[PDB]
Symmetry: D2
């Protein structure tokens, strides 16, 4: 295990690449322009990252399309693509410490979570998708004797992937895994708030055996290079994870361009329902606190709306606050630190604005609620719990994407479900009960892509992850993730 | 068995409904306004059809939402939904001749086609989807022993369906089948060029046992009621079959509204590739003629591009011309007629304008090329073949949606594949050969949702139907059609 | 609704067929020998049933083999087999009253059960299998580009089915459904204790459209005609439902002959586990009584072992005794009878022998325990409950196949599981509890093909049915039953 | 650069320390009786090691151990991802000991060292790896039930699995079974053939080193009529899987009926037809494949192309190509990497092959290649690749499995007769068709009653292809995800809500 002093030492002795990666080579943007990569830890300078635009996107697509048509990857044997992506995953573990440090410095996540959660799950996501390549079987229909009906899946071609900043490496690997496994060419557009991890792994892919031009990274802003890719006439599929606002615009961009397939993972207001007959209220309390404090509340499936039955609310709420004592906002370079820094100033101001909206809506602040650690020159906010919150208030409707918890009461099982579904979102939800019938009937009633019973943030690579309604469409992880990067073909042969 | 005089007699004594169908009852538009429905058979009047608008759509959505929330259909047992849908299918067969007569008068296709193909296939489409309901299994993931990972599917809720005019009944049932089977509430919006059969079957559904509000029909215009459904914040999913322009516009409406799931099926320029070593050149010639003449060429997967190998072009071309003679444009109410009228004047003018474009591109007219049966008062056109066509010409790249064929020569298998894939479309393709390797390798190389080998227009309800690229997304028929009306939920239960 | 007088009248005026059905025709045994088919209702004579032997098996197989090779049914289109088997199902319903009467007269079960349960389920079982034929897809493997790898299923050919007497018609259709659907020829050997219904539906099959020789019925003894089919060198597959002892002999016969596939469904000693925290204790008691009294306890999945927790046993037992009083043995031809007669004298003596064994083991007779209705000439035994039973006693370990209940108690969940799995059988089990974790963890711990939570005798045609250990191998119902009558073929094609 | 020679492999043979004890409960041990048998080599007749000769007492002890390990849940209730990771390490360990395992193979049963290393060990490792990777990719079912009801259809390990593996592919066949069986969480007792026990004895230790708990994977060397019979008759063995002859396979099925009605999955003999049409894409390639289909692994392959069905119109031009191609397959020292054809497993097998060759002459068939014992002066058992011409499908050498490099050439007039001749057999394990015609390739393939049909190639299919026979060639399938079904039970859990 590395010491805090070791991480800071390596942070100084760290050479960072900021160039784009096209056709197996690192290069600058066509304009040569660049934005500064700032660290939210202490406002330090990390590197100067290439700022791509339309010209870079046009070049990357041609390279991606040519690589796809060549067949170097798209028509490579399934078992061989599997072995290549496994080496890709293995290389992520070999360079785990650097990747973890890059991410922590990039967006502020505690170094322990960058190494043991981010990097570890990222390599697993690539490996699992690789292992699944030659385990998938296509279909043969029941036809008359003198006829053969084949139903097969083929790679779409050129795939554009726009990755957020909360889990830059992990979300990249959730997209890269199945997309590369199916044999597509990928153009990765990382978030401008965290481009370092995407830039680094692009070289690792080529070292693993991924042919030139199959995996490309175009750093920059969403309104520039991101918009260019979404509007490009030769991009077949665009996958995205982020806000509902941006996701809506990307779908419009598709309707204005080439009718490209769009698969979106928007935001969410995931309810965490706690009944009176919960097996362990303490465990549920620790979970409810962790569901809003982990990754500084910067999680799409954060347990923002904590629903508690009136029978236990007076006992349960003190346990949540007591459990939240352990989630300290500290130095992201310290392994012992539970909660790190927010991504940037704008994010903090937004979170603090919602905290301000919390008071103005008439909510009773019972924990935190203020900016912390300003002396570091960093961006930090302490975990926050608002009591007496109804589902009509602003802080209950809108997604804060910060460590702010709304506690809501319900009378019975019917109301809890009514409140939980009272949202345009539907990414996740949780149920805490020891009753067999109620657990299942509630989970079925909830309109969410992921329902966790007697736990929060469950499910591994075998669990399809996505949302209902405005939380997005399509699924990441599992075998269902492959469907987003493939086209069905019905080959009917007359014998 | 019925003669020409029989169908013309029934057409004069036919009482046609023109109202919308909302919540189990027929009703005029909220504005009371209507539009005239004319017959392209001879320009006769049929009935006044309700012209719905935003208000009507607003009412139907709440009706559909309430029906879905009640659970009268959405939470009915799968086996019971099966029985009802089968009863629905049977009712189409009992009213087969009326539905066939309505279809023929509405949009012009021959009566024998309406009865023996359209009505039969539509009923089969409903029955097949019904039979499939309780045969589909969801998933249980491989999890640790102290955990249960359920992966299930649930109906999306309210489903809007915009249906084309070329196959009004059949395309409606391709949507209605899987949409109703999954337990969703459906709001059908038929084409203004052919609203009758959609209006009629709405009554048959409730007679079969479909609860009120589950299946609603709103006739009208795309920019009014269609636009309203596409922009409604409470519509979960939109399905569509039509033009690329409209399909692209619908996707924008979703991005502007509630980010609703959109499944589109656009046009196509399907290449019909005939090699020298085809098993039977005569049979391929018959299929080549039929691939452009059937349903007046108003077919999405019409063989509008006949790709012939150069070494057999001089022998195969006359065979196609001779075979095309068998398809005579005539009185659609005559059982012997195999080529009916075009849907309306504007469609005829579009076809005629493309024939003019054929001459101006330098192509050699070798069959048809003129408007026919003008004295009847209906819009008709001769099946048309152009020779000496290159894939760069206007008639070879743009969809005509008429019986206009483009004959293009190729040298070898590599050129054929290149010419075939050189199109923004990708809905269907066909290969004619007796060689094992060449048949399979070509079929794999074609970018089309359906590849027919040694036959044309193949595949039944077991064959998924849809497009690559700008021919659309998602699949009709097969079990895959059900996935367009369901949402995946990952329920991970801690034990 | 027919009355007791109606059924008794139809019984006396019923003409019964007792010949075998080979190659589409009724005919006597080759030796001309017959056996007397008597009714357990009152000992009356019903018909002289053909007593087939080796020579009849040899002829039937040749007929079945020729029918399979002709491809009239085996190579008929999947959708055509579906439509025919659906007509088969309809013919069972059109002859429901006749079939129900035969069943009741043949083996003694209540007329209401034969009609509203047995016939209705038999027809549904056939219908469900038929609907499933063209819903099943075979597989295409993930192979290198220059290769096509198909994984398909083909009918085995000649299938021999030996069915029991407890559910003569239903068990027949459980085999017939998937066997005929997949295209096989079937030779059905009904139990000599209940041959009538099998003989009847054979004619119904050919009326529906089943080709001659595809479905044959050979009535007779197990040691004569059953042994001949099991030893026949041209029978591809043998399916069976009955006792463990007979199932073992058949597996030996196969090993001595042509190594034919053997799928067995032997006996069971199903534990019905009732926890203290069951949702409805009244419903649990009502179900427990029905689990041993329904069909005269002649059910392989009968709850012959009732497991009650100590903290509720003294309160739960009188509820079971009271519930059992509703199940009164009586005239099977009376619509209001819920408990009929045992199949014959041998079965009655066997059941009575185990009741005496219960006394010998030291158990306490707390309900029933005697033969009844001896004056009628039939064989009846009243529902019997033994209390104070340990899992070492004879009546707890050996299958009785009568309405005899053994009540065993346990301290905790661990002991319940240990006692439940302490048996050479593993066909079914039930768990009654309201706790989420306890329900699932117990169900996963029980070694039974079927596990019913908070209910008994659950699962429709979607649920596979079979046993662990000595309860047999393979599954009936669901889509898994199809695999017992098909062979896998891997066709690897080099392109 | 470096290159292993014949002398290098021979020197490795004299250095090699060979383990011969049984492996029960994570430890090596003798048989309870202490009896052993002499493991000899068909390479030159040399002594290899004294291998434990187990019996009833050892089978009883191994089952109890296997049962206890299963019930403990140390492996059976371990997470799928963790079972996956353990078996990958197991697969990696086979690769890290590839040279030793391959040498053990060659010395034991006589196949060429280049085959043992590049084919057997490599495939066996990949088979374990593939089955491991597939563990958490498989999904159980949820049925379409009424709303207030939940219907789960799940799979669970059977418990104790006895595996009886043949001698022709000792390591590979072992891993075809061990892969899916251990992946599903079962305890396995492996009984290797008495003609080749060494590799099974070896890998047992490697499983333990990889993380497989004690008693989960046991190895009992000995005879089939003793310990093999004991496992088949045991009342606590849940499942018996087997690959070998039709006669023994039938016998095991009897033992199951006589004991506890244990599930029995078998892969018996075969007489696979290799069908070559006039319109074959490449006659030269088909001729090379035909020769290889009978010479590879000394013809001791279940799916060997023992029947060559040739269309009459090309018989006179196809046969000389096959005879020429057969010359490339020369019997030689198995320890020489250049050798492509090794030795037969023992003297008994050699005599049987020689007996069938004599029967070929007696049936009236014409000898056109090989037909004699060779390399007799080496002290080893070798037989030349043999081709008989003018064979009918009624002759003894055409209907009976030879399990040696003896090919039967049979003529047919057309596709209809070809299918008839090809199906005229009690077996149905494999078949091949060579044609360039689309319709004829598919229709013939569909008409052939065989578990594996290869078109325009021979011995095709990787781990994604199910492998097993029709009729008397056995039941069930090895490889693919279908293999897992032989080691699991279906459970329908219907929960009323
Ligand atoms: K940054
Ligand atoms: K019209
Ligand atoms: K009887
Ligand atoms: K040996």
């Amino acid at each position: 295990t590395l010491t805090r002093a070791d991480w800071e030492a390596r942070a100084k002795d760290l050479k960072i690449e900021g160039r784009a990666f096209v056709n197996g080579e690192y290069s600058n943007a066509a304009s040569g322009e660049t934005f500064d990569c700032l660290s939210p830890v202490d406002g330090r300078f990390l590197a100067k990252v290439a700022s791509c635009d339309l010209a870079d996107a046009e070049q990357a697509v041609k390279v991606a399309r040519n690589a796809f048509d060549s067949g170097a990857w798209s028509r490579l044997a399934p078992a061989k693509r599997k072995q290549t992506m496994i080496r890709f995953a293995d290389l992520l573990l070999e360079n785990a410490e650097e990747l973890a440090l890059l991410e922590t410095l990039d967006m502020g996540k505690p170094i322990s979570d960058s190494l043991h959660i981010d990097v570890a799950s990222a390599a697993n996501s690539l490996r699992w998708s690789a292992e699944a390549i030659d385990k998938i079987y296509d279909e043969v229909a029941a036809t008359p004797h003198a006829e053969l009906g084949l139903v097969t899946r083929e790679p779409v071609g050129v795939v554009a992937a726009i990755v957020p900043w909360n889990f830059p490496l992990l979300m990249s690997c959730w997209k890269l895994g199945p997309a590369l496994a199916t044999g597509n060419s990928v153009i990765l557009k990382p978030s401008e708030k965290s481009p370092l991890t995407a830039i680094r792994i692009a070289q690792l892919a080529v070292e693993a055996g991924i042919p030139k031009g199959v995996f490309n990274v175009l750093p920059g802003y969403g309104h520039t290079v991101g918009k260019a890719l979404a509007l490009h006439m030769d991009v077949d599929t665009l996958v995205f994870t982020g806000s509902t606002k941006i996701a809506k615009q990307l779908m419009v961009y598709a309707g204005e361009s080439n009718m490209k397939r769009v698969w979106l993972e928007a935001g969410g207001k995931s309810p965490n329902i706690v009944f009176a007959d919960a097996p362990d209220l303490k465990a549920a309390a620790e979970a409810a606190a962790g569901a809003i404090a982990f990754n500084q509340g910067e999680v799409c499936t954060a347990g923002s709306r904590l629903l508690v039955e009136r029978s236990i609310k007076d006992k349960f709420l003190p346990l949540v606050i007591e459990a939240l004592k352990g989630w300290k906002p500290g130095n992201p370079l310290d392994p012992e630190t539970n909660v790190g820094a927010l991504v940037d100033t704008q994010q903090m101001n937004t979170v603090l604005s919602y905290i301000e909206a919390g008071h103005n809506d008439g909510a009773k602040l019972v924990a935190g609620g203020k900016r912390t650690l300003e002396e570091t020159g960093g961006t930090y906010v302490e975990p926050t719990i608002f009591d007496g919150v109804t589902n009509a208030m602003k802080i209950a409707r809108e997604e804060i994407f910060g460590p702010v918890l709304s506690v809501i009461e319900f009378e019975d099982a019917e109301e809890a479900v009514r409140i939980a579904n009272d949202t345009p979102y539907g990414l996740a939800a949780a149920v805490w009960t020891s009753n067999l019938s109620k657990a299942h009937l509630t989970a079925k009633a909830l309109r969410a892509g992921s329902v966790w019973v007697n736990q929060y943030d469950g499910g591994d690579m075998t669990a399809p992850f996505g949302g209902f309604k405005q939380s997005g469409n399509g699924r990441d992880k599992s075998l269902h993730a492959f469907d987003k990067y493939t086209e069905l073909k019905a080959t009917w042969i007359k014998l």
